[PDB]
Design a protein around this ligand. Structure first.
Ligand code: GDP
Ligand code: NAG
Lengths: 232, 67, 296, 350, 53, 336
């Protein structure tokens, strides 16, 4: 139930850099991991992904041909090799977890994360609002439109809803537009039409302030949304 | 190639030396499928003899038939 | 005029009479092979997944046999009419034909060899190594058919390898290699392995050993009967090419008649493989019933 | 027509089939040997010896763990002795002995865990009576436990405080286990596993079909049992019971494929018992000589072999002594060979 | 000794039960089966569009 | 001794009273009913993932997931719509004889010949199933298990007793004794207040889960019974016996109403189950084919075939929309 990474520091352009994600405390052999980028002045960005038993590997188009991830199951580790790092590659790096079958909830648990600095179409989601002055004691509504009918033939909608308290790691809030992750109070509930989904935080409480993040998973490469910042 | 399809029928071995041109009536060319390097000539005796094209006499015979 | 010792002969009539029977045999063997190999290549992979080495070998065998049978209508068209040579050079046809024949023979050997190792020593090899051995056998079949590949194609509106190579023994060496490689080795290996397995299966109590021993004797009697005459006739032709025996035209024409007829008979053996190997098994028959049910 | 999320589920099911096939191949090298036989024949003792010869798993703490069962055994045996004594109405010669019975009779067998001086003195004084000795000499009727002579002569070796059971002793304790006991082990890259079905007291028809296509049946018969009768039913022959069981076993279709090997046991007692008893009295058919171990052994084996309805199954036999250790070491080596060759696996041979 | 007493006791307690007319129960079961008969798909088939199999 | 004659007298009293109650047969009332006609069934899916004969399976409340138990020491969960496999779980005591699925969708109960029914927690952190409670104490051999909630479980074994257990505490609460043969099957009512259990003495019994005393006893069969199942409304139950003659009993009238029988059948009964609407009875035979009988008329309606060995288990989904069959061939087949 603990994931720790390493390999933080300063690098020079035109080189190599290994990054390691450890894994202790679970049956690591059957967990498809991902990697997540977070720029210090923008939202989130998908980096890469490894399946179970190395049977499938994907990459983001903006990074193809520069990275590589290999999983060492006997010692429970994961390596990412970078070459020819550019100036835009400084960010915060998160190691996550996800298991996919019927009725399970991906993206349960997120790592602590490692920082990396340097010196020298596809479905696009949208946010209609940024600042929202909170009103303690009442209800609040957040909205997210899209650019495609996220409804599928099987009758499920692959839209998620996150939370990220300041100076922490984000945890899951709502998966597939109706359910709630086991470990959150029942105040949360999301309703939406095919074009647009809204979340209704009822009866706000202290310490609930956080930056939210709409996320879709219809077809790879899945992207994020800018989200909203609650303030008071 | 493999047995069962073979379109040539002449399998001569011995080369003829010399023939009297008078007895010769008909000039043929050996089948080129199996590529045997012979030449067929039918005489007034209604029998066929196989020779080699390098002799001048076959050229004289082809000239005689051409005329 | 005066003296003409040389006397050539012609044999058009025997060729003309031979053509219809071999043509009909080609047609029937093609039809039955096409309709009797698709079933095995379907029922063992599409629904029923792969269990062990035996099913991999069965699939590969059926595939080689299907490749063998898929060329035949090209020869059927080429026989009666020799037009449209531009469609394909003969080299590819001869190459695919011979490599298919050798692959089928080598798998008939290999399935018996593995069935020998497995039962007596309780050895069960993993699937991946079976795949590697299958690829090795295909490569061996490809690399052993090289001598026949040098065939001139559509030269002067006909395709055959020119007998102009300096070596006068090239046809005899091809014939002897073909007979030795394709006959004694499979018979020897199959007979020895089955004979060895026969005693062990004849001692233990299985309540149905009788069927096993009858199947083995059927397999060897079938393989032996069909291939013998062709190799004996080819042997007699090889002795003739060495000029040891006296040569006469009637001998030549009757030898060609017998050779073409027994060659036409020989190809019928390829289609019979699925009935002899796979279908006798109860499980496959029941799966075939379960597949006949759904589609109708 | 799929999505981009269920492909993970397809990959998962593919990898689980790939996981299952390894266990498929793994479970083709085992031969279950189903043991059978009536009560007190000695089914457990074979498993125990078997454990000793190959597994060698006994440890000092494991040996210690049986002490309670040892005490339970000794007490239940003794209580059976008193019950038999009062059953046949045999007068006591000593008045103190009559009193010494009340204190040991109504005793909860399960609760007792240790000794004090009182029980040791009681047992020592009770054993001394020649009435108990003659009752032991007449142990035919009341079916007392066979392994009572060993313990009742060495009660003082148990009465000490620092008691560690020895290797020899442990092989004779009878451990109460209701569930079937299964013991796997491996020799020469062949894993054997055998099961025991002497612990189930419910109807047999319901659970027997769960044993379809076992490789071998190992039947066990006691030799010395032949002359034991019961008071409750005027006619009682333990042999006839085992014979009826054996006749029933071969008529079930479930075991037609499996081979049948029948072991005999307790030959030693037999050679120490015939010296004053005549088999011909029990069975009229016998007509050979008397005071002959060979004649009785041959007769018993012949009759069991002859009791085959099918007449197409060659049943084998061996003579063994359960307590010995080298005898089993040799007989099992024999059976391994004569069973492994007579077994085959199809493997697509049709 | 004691099991006989328990059995006689249980049998003696096994009498105070109302017995309704069989006809009424049969009519009840005919009503219930008739009323919901439409719903069952195994008795009256369904179009292929709704059926996921 | 006088107790025996008093018991005989009470038996005569109960027999005469129940005889007095019976006015008319069901057939006379059910004459003016249109028949079902002819119904056929097709195989929609073939699930194949086992190496040994299958003993039990049970549907899920969700109506999509099913769990199957085989002798290979492994029980697996199948997704019915697209045939893929979610959870294959090994179990220690390789001789299994019944399975059961929790209504909550969190637990799975399996029992067998070693007399220990191990309950398995499914949804847990680290995504690996583990054994929760090694429930023990019963003697003989367990025969079936049915959850009542996420806590209470009923068990029946060869000790001629029925026992109610609590998972958290781990100790017995109530014993339902009084049988003399051996209990074979259990069946909970939809309201989860009453269950009936059939013994090997050819006798059914209705139990009260609260008070703990056997409310009603049902005699009549001439041999051991093998399967019991409630009418969907909760007022009657059907029984399958080795004499091949299934029978129906209603609770309120306290007598048998109708018997299924025919001369060409002599085999036993492995499984019995109504349909959702209540007009159909699926029964499973040893003649390799299960039969669909209409409830109120005793005529047949067709046949399902396709197996080589006996059919070991049946399952009707809560929507009355599909039927699963499991037979001794390592195959499961779904019919629609
Ligand atoms: N001295 C001696 N005792 C034996 C021999 N065979 C069996 N016994 C005794 O007979 C008893 C049989 O016990 P057990 O294995 O439980 O018989 P089971 O009830 O059929 O399983 C054991 O306690 C042994 O002490 C033998 O060859 N010699
Ligand atoms: C045999 O071949 C020669 C060579 O061209 C040909 O002229 C002759 O007609 C052929 N004989 C036949 C076709 O009977």
């Amino acid at each position: 139930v603990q994931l720790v990474e390493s390999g933080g520091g300063l690098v020079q352009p035109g080189g190599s850099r290994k990054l390691s994600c450890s894994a202790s405390g679970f049956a690591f052999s059957s967990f498809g991991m991902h990697w997540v980028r977070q720029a210090p002045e923008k939202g989130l960005e998908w980096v890469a992904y490894i399946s179970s038993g190395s049977g499938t590997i994907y990459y983001a188009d903006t990074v193809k041909g520069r990275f590589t991830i290999s999983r060492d199951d006997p010692k429970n580790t994961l390596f990412l090799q970078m070459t020819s790092l550019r100036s835009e590659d400084t960010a915060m790096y998160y190691c996550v977890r996800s298991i996919y079958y019927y009725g399970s909830s991906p993206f349960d648990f997120w790592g602590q994360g490692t920082t990396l600095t340097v010196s020298s179409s596809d479905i696009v989601m949208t946010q209609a609002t940024s600042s929202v002055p909170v009103t303690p004691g009442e209800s609040v509504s957040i909205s997210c439109r899209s650019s495609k009918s996220l409804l599928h033939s099987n009758g499920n909608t692959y839209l998620y809803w996150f939370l990220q308290r300041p100076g922490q790691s984000p945890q899951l809030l709502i998966y597939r537009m109706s359910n709630l992750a086991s470990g959150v109070p029942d105040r949360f509930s999301g309703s939406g039409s095919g074009t647009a989904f809204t979340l209704t935080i009822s009866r706000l409480e202290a310490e609930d302030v956080g930056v939210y993040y709409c996320m879709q998973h219809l077809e790879y490469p899945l992207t994020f949304g800018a989200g909203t910042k609650l303030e008071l | 190639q493999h047995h069962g399809v073979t379109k040539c029928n002449i399998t001569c071995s011995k080369m003829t030396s010399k023939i009297p041109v008078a007895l010769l009536i008909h000039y043929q060319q050996n089948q080129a499928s199996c590529g045997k390097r012979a030449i067929i000539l039918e005489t007034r005796q209604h029998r066929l003899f196989c020779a080699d094209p390098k002799e001048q006499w076959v050229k004289d015979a082809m000239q005689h038939l051409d005329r | 005029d005066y003296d003409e010792d040389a006397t050539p002969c012609v044999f058009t009539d025997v060729l003309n009479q031979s053509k219809p029977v071999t043509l009909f045999l080609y047609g029937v063997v093609f039809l039955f092979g096409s309709i009797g190999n698709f079933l095995v290549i379907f029922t063992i992979t599409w629904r029923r997944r792969i269990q062990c080495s035996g099913d991999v070998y069965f699939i590969n065998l059926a595939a080689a046999d299907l490749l063998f049978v898929c060329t035949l209508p090209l020869w059927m068209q080429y026989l009666l009419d020799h037009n449209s040579l531009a469609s394909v050079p003969c080299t590819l046809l001869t190459a695919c034909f011979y490599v298919a024949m050798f692959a089928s023979l080598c798998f008939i050997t290999e399935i018996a060899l593995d069935r020998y190792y497995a039962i007596v020593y309780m050895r069960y090899r993993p699937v991946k190594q079976a795949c590697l051995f299958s690829i090795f056998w295909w490569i061996f079949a490809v690399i052993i058919a090289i001598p026949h590949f040098m065939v001139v194609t559509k030269k002067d509106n006909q395709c055959m390898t020119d007998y102009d190579y300096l070596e006068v023994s090239y046809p005899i060496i091809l014939n002897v290699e073909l007979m030795l490689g394709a006959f004694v080795i499979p018979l020897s290996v199959i007979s020895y392995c089955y004979y060895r397995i026969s005693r062990i299966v004849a001692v233990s109590q299985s309540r149905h050993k009788g069927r096993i021993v009858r199947v083995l004797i059927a397999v060897v009697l079938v393989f032996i009967i069909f291939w013998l005459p062709y190799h004996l006739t080819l042997f007699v032709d090889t002795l003739k090419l060495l000029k040891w025996i006296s040569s006469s035209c009637e001998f030549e024409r009757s030898l060609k008649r017998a050779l073409i007829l027994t060659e036409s008979l020989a190809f019928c053996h390829c289609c019979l493989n699925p009935l002899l190997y796979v279908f006798v098994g109860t499980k496959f028959r029941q799966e075939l019933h379960c597949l006949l049910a759904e589609f109708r | 027509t799929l999505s981009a999320e269920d492909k993970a589920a397809v990959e998962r099911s593919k990898m689980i089939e790939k996981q299952l096939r390894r266990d498929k191949r793994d479970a083709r090298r085992e031969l279950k040997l189903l043991l059978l036989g009536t009560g007190e024949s000695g089914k457990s003792t074979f498993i125990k010896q078997m454990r000793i010869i190959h597994g060698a798993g006994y440890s000092e703490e494991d040996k210690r763990g049986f002490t309670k069962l040892v005490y339970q055994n000794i007490f239940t045996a003794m209580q059976a002795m008193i019950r038999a004594m009062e059953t046949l109405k045999i007068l006591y010669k000593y008045e103190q002995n009559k009193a010494n019975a009340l204190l040991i009779r109504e005793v909860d067998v399960e609760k007792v865990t240790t000794f004090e001086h009182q029980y040791v003195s009681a047992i020592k004084t009770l054993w001394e009576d020649p009435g108990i000795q003659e009752c032991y000499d007449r142990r035919r009727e009341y079916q007392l436990s066979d392994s009572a002579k060993y313990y009742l002569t060495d009660v003082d070796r148990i009465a000490t405080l620092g008691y560690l059971p020895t290797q020899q002793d442990v092989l004779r304790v009878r451990v109460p286990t209701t569930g079937i006991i299964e013991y796997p082990f491996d020799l020469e890259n062949i894993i054997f596993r055998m099961v025991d079905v002497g612990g189930q007291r419910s109807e047999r028809r319901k659970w027997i079909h769960c044993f379809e296509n076992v490789t071998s049946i190992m039947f066990l018969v006691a030799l010395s049992e032949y002359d034991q009768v019961l008071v409750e039913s005027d006619n009682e022959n333990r042999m006839e019971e085992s014979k009826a069981l054996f006749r029933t076993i071969i008529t079930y279709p479930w075991f037609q494929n499996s081979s049948v090997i029948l072991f005999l046991n307790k030959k030693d007692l037999l050679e120490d018992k015939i010296l004053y008893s005549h088999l011909v009295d029990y069975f009229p058919e016998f007509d050979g000589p008397q005071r002959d171990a060979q004649a009785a052994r041959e007769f018993i084996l012949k009759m069991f072999v002859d009791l085959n309805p099918d007449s197409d199954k060659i049943i084998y036999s061996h003579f063994t002594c359960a307590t010995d250790t080298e005898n089993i070491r040799f007989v099992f080596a024999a059976v391994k060979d004569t069973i492994l060759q007579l077994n085959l696996k199809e493997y697509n041979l049709v | 000794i004691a099991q006989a007493r328990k059995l006689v006791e249980q049998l003696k307690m096994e009498a105070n039960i109302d017995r309704i007319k069989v006809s009424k129960a049969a009519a009840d079961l005919m009503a219930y089966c008739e009323a919901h008969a439409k719903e069952d798909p195994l008795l009256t088939p369904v179009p292929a569009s709704e059926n996921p199999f | 001794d006088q107790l025996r004659q008093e018991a005989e007298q009470l038996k005569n009293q109960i027999r005469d009273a129940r005889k007095a109650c019976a006015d008319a047969t069901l057939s006379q009332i059910t004459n003016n009913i249109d028949p079902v006609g002819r119904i056929q069934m097709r195989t929609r899916r073939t699930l194949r993932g086992h190496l040994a004969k299958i003993y039990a399976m049970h549907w899920g409340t969700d109506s999509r997931l099913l769990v199957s138990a085989s002798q290979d020491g492994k029980l697996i969960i199948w997704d019915s719509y697209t045939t893929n496999k979610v959870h294959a779980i090994p179990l220690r005591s390789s001789w299994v004889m019944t399975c059961a699925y929790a209504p909550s969708g969190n637990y799975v109960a399996c029992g067998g010949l070693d007399n220990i029914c191990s309950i398995y927690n499914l949804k847990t952190r680290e995504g690996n199933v583990r054994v929760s409670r090694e429930l023990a104490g019963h003697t003989g051999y367990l025969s079936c298990c049915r959850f009542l909630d996420d806590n209470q479980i009923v068990t029946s074994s060869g000790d001629t007793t029925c026992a109610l257990w609590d998972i958290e505490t781990g100790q017995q609460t109530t014993t339902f004794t009084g049988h003399t043969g051996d209990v074979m099957s259990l069946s909970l009512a939809p309201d989860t207040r009453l269950f009936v259990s059939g013994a090997c003495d050819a006798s059914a019994k209705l139990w009260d889960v609260r008070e703990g005393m056997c409310r009603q006893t049902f005699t009549g069969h001439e041999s051991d019974i093998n399967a019991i199942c409630f009418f969907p409304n909760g007022n009657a139950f059907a029984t399958g016996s080795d004499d091949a003659t299934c029978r129906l009993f209603d609770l309120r009238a306290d007598q048998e109403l109708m018997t299924y029988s025919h001369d060409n059948i002599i085999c036993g009964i492995t499984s019995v189950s109504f349909s959702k609407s209540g007009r159909l009875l699926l029964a499973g035979y040893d003649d390799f084919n299960c039969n669909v009988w209409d409830a109120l008329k005793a005529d047949r309606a067709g046949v399902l075939a396709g197996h080589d060995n006996r059919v070991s288990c049946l399952g009707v989904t809560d929507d009355g929309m599909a039927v699963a069959t499991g037979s001794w061939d390592s195959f499961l087949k779904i019919w629609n």
